[PDB]
Design a protein around this nucleic acid. Structure first.
Ligand code: MG
Ligand code: MG
Ligand code: MG
Ligand code: MG
Ligand code: MG
Ligand code: MG
Ligand code: MG
Ligand code: MG
Ligand code: MG
Ligand code: MG
Ligand code: MG
Ligand code: MG
Ligand code: MG
Ligand code: MG
Ligand code: MG
Lengths: 185, 49, 104
RNA sequence: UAAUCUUAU
RNA sequence: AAGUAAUUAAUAUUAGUAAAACAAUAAGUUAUAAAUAAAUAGAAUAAUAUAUAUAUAUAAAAAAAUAUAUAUUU
RNA sequence: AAUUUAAUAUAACUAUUAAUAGAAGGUUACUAAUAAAUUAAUAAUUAAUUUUAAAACCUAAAGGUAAACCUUUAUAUUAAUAAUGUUAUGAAUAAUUAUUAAUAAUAAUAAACUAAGUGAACUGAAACAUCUAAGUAACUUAAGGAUAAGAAAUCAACAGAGAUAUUAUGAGUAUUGGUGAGAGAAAAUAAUAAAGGUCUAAUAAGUAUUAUGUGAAAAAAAUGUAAGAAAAUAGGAUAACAAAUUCUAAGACUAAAUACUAUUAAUAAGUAUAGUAAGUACCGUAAGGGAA
């Protein structure tokens, strides 16, 4: 097979922003939660952006009679709503799937496994939703593997002292600001 | 935020690092000389015939 | 000698640079991790146990071999025994005629 | 009936 | 304010070259052999067709058709 | 000293070739200004390079709206001080001014070229229904200075070749068609072209393949539904099978020749009704049409 309707897609190349450079005119309010999906978000069978369609877009072709009188028809995939169990998330995740995709999931032995397969083909035939799911699972796995220590209290201890010092000079200081200051330190 | 690396990807990276760590095959001056001499001999033989 | 070597075609020169003749590369398929792994053969990766495709794909390999033949630098290239390709006079001599030719 | 699906909170 | 242009094919006239022409890097097109659906066939054994070549047919002729031959190849 | 002829301007468009590069409108006003440096050659300078000021309102996307208006309140808080006047008991509570620190904001952005989605009909076939027109027009979406393609699961044929892409021959040949209308390759040889090869993949499975429904007029690679392999001892390629040959799918990157726009130069058996105004006048509710 091929992933033509996926890998054809192109997204505007964001310029790498240095810390000292000037701002863009429209900077967003809330930050980027998820990583950027290489292949954007489908602009044709937008039905499939909400689910795990397995790179199965709608076809259009011809109904043909005994007289060979051609008439345009479309061929939809066998989509199905299906709440499937994630071991990593410890909850079942309900989404639209192609019956094919459900079969693949069953073969691979789980939904998390299906999401996390490292092949490029899989990545292509994950949606934007599928990509987000993968990210959620992978991040959770990483957390499970590696808890922070294998600092917050120190910051909390120092904060009031820092505030007092600021006041003694003359200025007031708030927590959030303190946190912002001492993130990289 | 950058997506984390899955297990297979990490293993591949480790393998690549190990490969890099080994001594790299590099074409020595001596090897080039040996080749060049052989080429010359071949040319001489061609000229003769 | 060095000047003569330099005068060799580009692809051949590049090959010699990146797979030099000091290393005696294997005739048979090997581990992908091995130093003597033949770039023309499909070597097996030891962990996954999957045959990797040759580092030099078959066309490129053939071109390299033809270049070597032209400039008489065959034996410095690693062996093409277990790659099924023969070339020119050796191919002509060693081959069996087709069943159709011998027995119509 | 933890296949599916409809409704209400 | 109305037979124009492009890419092609066939004729004719002239001009260049000519059993060759165009092109010169090779490659190609046309000509130089006529046939036949096609095939491994193809033009005086001692001369004008009464000979020869091909297609049908055949042991080989004859028979229909078209083509080839009477110092210099067209 | 003057006249003529030809060429050149800040001051025409159009076609070609070459080279280079990938770019604000309107509205009406409390009109929407600028300042400098260094280097060059002989203080002012022109030129190059660099810095710097202001710049209203509207042009979907601070929030509205009946474009050039209204409302949000950054000549804002919040805090800390200082000066002032009042209340109640030197300390406390509110208001005004002036410094210091902290908190957010301004989409007018091309068009052509490219890729993807959906996809007509008139028309041709001297009718028309397969076929054609045509994957064209159109609408929709998305990208970049170009995009696309690209280092063979390619071609070929027992001899061999060796990314791409465009053109010439091959060739209107093979091929195909209600065998009608008509449609039509590839190998090979030439140019143009750039260093043109090179790993970035732990070598790829619901994949190849099969059935079935569709699918570039020849030549497939694609695709909905469902069955579904193999390890280089293998796998792809041709009705089929046997031999042979060739290549390695389900992981990737890539200048260059090309397209379009703009600029500059050069050439015009081009334009003065293809020679600069104006998308104005005017027509229409509107999209839109459009003079002299
Ligand atoms: Mg007969
Ligand atoms: Mg706005
Ligand atoms: Mg008609
Ligand atoms: Mg009628
Ligand atoms: Mg068509
Ligand atoms: Mg289209
Ligand atoms: Mg590209
Ligand atoms: Mg052609
Ligand atoms: Mg591969
Ligand atoms: Mg493989
Ligand atoms: Mg099929
Ligand atoms: Mg066509
Ligand atoms: Mg490959
Ligand atoms: Mg690419
Ligand atoms: Mg009116």
């Amino acid at each position: 097979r091929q992933w033509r309707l996926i890998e054809t897609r192109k997204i505007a190349k964001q310029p790498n922003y240095q810390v000292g450079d000037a701002k863009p005119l429209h900077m967003p309010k809330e930050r980027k939660k998820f990583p950027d999906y290489k292949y954007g978000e489908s602009n044709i069978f937008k039905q499939s952006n909400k689910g795990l369609y397995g790179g199965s877009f709608v076809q259009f072709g011809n109904n043909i009679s005994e007289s060979k009188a051609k008439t345009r028809k479309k061929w939809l995939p066998n989509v199905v709503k299906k709440g499937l169990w994630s071991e990593t998330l410890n909850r079942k995740i309900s989404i639209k799937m192609t019956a094919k995709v459900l079969k693949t999931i069953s073969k691979e032995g789980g939904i998390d496994n299906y999401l996390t397969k490292e092949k490029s083909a899989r990545i292509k035939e994950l949606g934007p939703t599928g990509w987000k799911l993968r990210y959620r699972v992978l991040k959770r796995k990483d957390e499970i593997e590696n808890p922070p220590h294998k600092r917050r209290r120190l910051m909390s201890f120092l904060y009031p002292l820092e505030k007092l010092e600021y006041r003694s000079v003359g200025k007031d200081l708030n927590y959030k600001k303190f946190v912002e200051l001492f993130a990289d330190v | 935020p950058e997506m984390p690396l899955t297990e297979v990807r990490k293993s591949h990276l480790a393998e690549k690092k190990e490969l890099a760590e080994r001594e790299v095959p590099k074409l020595t001056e001596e090897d080039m000389e040996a080749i060049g001499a052989r080429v010359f001999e071949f040319l001489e033989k061609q000229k003769r015939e | 000698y060095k000047q003569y070597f330099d005068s060799l075609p580009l692809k051949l020169k590049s090959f010699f640079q990146r797979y030099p003749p000091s290393i005696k590369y294997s005739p048979v398929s090997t581990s992908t991790k091995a130093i003597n792994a033949n770039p023309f053969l499909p070597n097996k990766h030891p962990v996954t146990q999957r045959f990797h495709d040759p580092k030099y794909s078959l066309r490129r390999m053939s071109d390299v071999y033809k270049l070597a033949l032209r400039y008489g630098v065959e034996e410095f290239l690693p062996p093409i025994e277990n790659t099924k390709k023969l070339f020119f006079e050796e191919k002509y001599n060693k081959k069996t005629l087709m069943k159709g030719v011998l027995l119509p």
